[PDB]
């Protein structure tokens, strides 16, 4: 997407690992707010959105 017209993916009714994500050398940035990435794998969410 162009940033003036960004795109949302809803994530729901599913399971994931986040540690495979934040250890990936592909990510030129991986900041977090209200949660620590180290803690993500212990959680569950009503939904997640990207």
């Amino acid at each position: 997407a162009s940033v003036y017209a960004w795109n949302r993916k809803r994530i729901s009714n599913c399971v994931a690992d986040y540690s495979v994500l934040y250890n990936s050398a592909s990510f030129s940035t991986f900041k977090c707010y209200g949660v620590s990435p180290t803690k993500l794998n212990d959680l569950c969410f009503t939904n997640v959105y990207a």
């Binding site: 250890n23 050398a25 990435p37 180290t38």
Partner: protein
């Protein structure tokens, strides 16, 4: 203590950090006292091939 790591992984050398170096190679105590010092050594540690 001394070792070589790649320039990205230098960010893992702190108390409270995670990632393969901090996880499985060299864990600082999360209440460490002292100094962490680093420099690029591409001109000394890299080899042809």
């Amino acid at each position: 203590d001394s070792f070589v790591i790649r320039g990205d992984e230098v960010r893992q050398i702190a108390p409270g950090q995670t990632g393969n170096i901090a996880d499985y190679n060299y864990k600082l105590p999360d209440d460490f006292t002292g100094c962490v010092i680093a420099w690029n050594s591409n001109n000394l540690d890299s080899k042809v091939g």
